[model samples]
Target: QLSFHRVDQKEITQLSHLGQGTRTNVYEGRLRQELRVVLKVLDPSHHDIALAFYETASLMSQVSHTHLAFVHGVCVRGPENIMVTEYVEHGPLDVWLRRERGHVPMAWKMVVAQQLASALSYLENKNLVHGNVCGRNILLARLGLAEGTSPFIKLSDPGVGLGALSREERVERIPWLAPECLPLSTAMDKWGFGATLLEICFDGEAPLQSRSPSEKEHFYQRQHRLPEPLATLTSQCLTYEPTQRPSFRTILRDLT
Candidate 1:
């Protein structure tokens, strides 16, 4: 199903450093000068760089959604090994929420959650699990089409790149990872959705983050009181038992 063509690094130009971690360098670039793109270049030192590159390229290339970030393909030749995706400006949700502060209303927050859940739902329907689902991974694009219309949501990092991203990043994901994850399952993603929804409800505040996985589970034990339907649904997402977690379809129904 993947046209899965190899993207030439030569075809990608205008590289500006966006960000960099130990193993991945993200650059804002253009494809043949025709399209705005982001090049996620992986450091060759990663043990399974090729596998991670192919997985992200093939997986995201298979999807089509207004809310999900569009991955063009992979670049494996030359010095750079990269995953090319549509350039999404405005950056991460938590950053935007922090910068804007009181400007973003509860309505937009719920709308963002709905759009994100919708995106995650699409992946779930395809039998995909977004290993990474959080405020940081959920990006914002346009502000609004017209007044009061929902802003564009671009869900990035569709569960790929276990090898390319370092152990530090994995540890960072502890708060979002369901207990069953690592073993990997759709229920893992449901747990992530719950944490992300909590972040949304509280202006992008990430919940239950801890240095140790054990501590995180303990944090999960201590509860917070949330209002009605939101409370019930949020609680369901964080349910310790994976089987009890609701699917995105159920989430959508409740949101509406």
Candidate 2:
């Protein structure tokens, strides 16, 4: 049995730590007959404990779309809630962008933008809001590859998101979070959608950077602008205010 209350020790083999955010430590794991999956082991240090993970698992499971990753299952076997989701291989958007040797092809970028817009439209139809939308949450997939080796785009990670119309749903997702999200609103989703477009266009470069957390916060408060390579289609998403952002339907029409 695993101590500190984690997954069943005998159920799977521990592979490696995928990434550790402030609230969770993700583990790459495989079971006897199950597909490879990423198990997000919630950090015990968090106050809300299971709310965030459970919320993510719940909302993501409600959405069914080709552009979205399927939520395999949930494991509530320990102090941490284990979310088992499909492990699509190309990694996060930031890693893919850096590996592209800067400035990916225009056609590829547009395709990704369209797919993301589709995913957002689906979520919006369901009345769900993705509080965090950035390079980290937008996972890369191997779908468009010739031999299942090359990297392509996929809109993923609907967890850390808001569902329905709960006033308590307000949460800051950092860097790419929409202005309204900081104040908590479904309207923020549009901002996130726009930011996601900017990321795909830049191949995942965040708008601003500072030496430390404090400086970064200061930079963001003043609404520091993003960098270039942006065309008119993508620029709209980076708007400072949530109300000013375009709708997903509008984005799709312009991109497609």
Candidate 3:
């Protein structure tokens, strides 16, 4: 039996829509006047959405890591099933990249890359995988200038099972997904992680976006490569065979 902090809808204030996905809508709200939180509510009208929502929330509640978002609790007693997490003010990595005209500072990029790898490593140790690992799923938080400290980057939206996303949503993410795991797999997270690096380097552009779908597939099937600063590591992650791809632990070591 898992334990969760049951919260009533009335307890949350300053609610404002943040974004929406196939089955959930995210909002930023103030909890108890002091705690700023991210609220994810499932649209119950969708078939089996509530069950999947609860299942995902239950799994996320078990883990805690510096590079992973902190899940406060779930609200099943509410009209809409909800998940609560500490607010990440900076929002997703993609938004940050899009707002920039040029690449983010190398220091910030390296810090974020290592944090991302660290989160995946932690999840793998727990025998779990972030089924959706991408720029949009990574949240950025800036830690003010402090000697001997790195920026804060956290991975969010864990346990979002592939089944929860619609076909079109999956298609949109195809560029980042590993060929071996068309939709989802633990081994495939490394591939997606590599793609996320490319996105960071290219300021939010999908990997090989300049090429046609067939061309991209052929490239992956034959020889996969990226430019300097990321080529060597990402190439290994983009390995055609999932088993050949380096483990998240190995990736984390290489990153650091």
Candidate 4:
């Protein structure tokens, strides 16, 4: 039923490894004349993983937005299963935050916040939740000091079902989750968006990063605080009660 393009393994030339996870390996590669493309290849050991990724890719293939990463094709013929997507030159937002936090301006942070909120709003309208919204998943592109040019944000790995991942992999994302994301809902993305804004506000430092797992519970239990302005908005998203959190549309309105 998938109508998107299917890429043959023989046609892809891997340039370098981008990242790895329990279920997949992301790589930088080219397609004949195409200079850049990111390949999300599922590990052969997990056919179920391949099946899960394929389903998400199929759903995402119909979605198109400025802030969402572009999926070009999928390789599901057999043996080699890969999801090919557009390559953004600057890489994930976390990398830039790590390198340029000291010099990155508040204006730029607001730009990211606005764009991300808008993206999520669009997805919500489509009845699709990004599911995974974090600094590591937000791709940064067109980062240069040229006049009239601006950095672009494109969200990657949107619908990745973390439930299918191992406990270890799932544990690593605990800090990003809302108190009640156990069932995984659109509301979780709202909380995650707030967490992402906090990272932007704090130069990519994840919420409760310095605290241990056990300590995190106590941390959120007591009064938590953030800097001015962002504190109000982020706190609203982090509301203990999921029903109290603002929607993506509201967040976008406040950010702009």
Off by over 4 Å in 4: 1-4, 76-78, 144-148, 213-229
**TM-scores for all candidates?**
0.85, 0.80, 0.84, 0.87
Which RMSD values do the candidates have, in order?
Answer: 3.4, 5.5, 3.2, 2.7
Worst 10 residues of 3 by lDDT: 220-229
Off by over 4 Å in 3: 1-3, 143-149, 208-229
lDDT (tens digit, per residue) of candidate 3 on 1-256: 5455777766776488999755678889777736999888777656465666666677677788888887777776346777888788688888778887384676777788898998888888877767778888888887423667667888886534666665555555656766764434578788888888888877777666677656666665665564543678888886767888888888888888
Which candidate has the top score in TM-score? 4
Candidate 1 per-residue lDDT, tens place, 1-256, comes to 4456678767877567977533667788888738988878777654475676667678778788889898877886576677888788887787777777767777777788889888888988999766778887788897663576668889886534554565556656756766555335778888888878877776665654524765654444453322223788888887778999998999998987
Q: Give the TM-score of candidate 2.
A: 0.80
Q: Is candidate 1 or candidate 4 better by lDDT?
A: 4
lDDT of each: 0.73, 0.63, 0.74, 0.75
Clashes of 2: 1
Model 1 has a clash total of 0
The segments of candidate 1 whose C-alpha lies over 4 angstroms from its true place after superposition are 1-3, 163-168, 209-229
Q: Could you tell me how far off, in angstroms, the CA of residue 82 lies in candidate 3 after the best superposition? A: 1.6
Tens digit of lDDT per residue, candidate 4, span 178-226?
6565335678788788888888878787767776665665555563543
TM-score of candidate 3 on Cα atoms, chains taken together = 0.84
Q: On residues 1-256, what C-alpha lDDT tens digit does candidate 2 reach at each position?
A: 1112233545655579989643667778885456687877665645444565566777677678877877665666545567677677877776777688455666666767777788888877777776666677778786353433334555666554343323323323445656544435556766666666666666666555224555545555777765544356456766776677777788788877
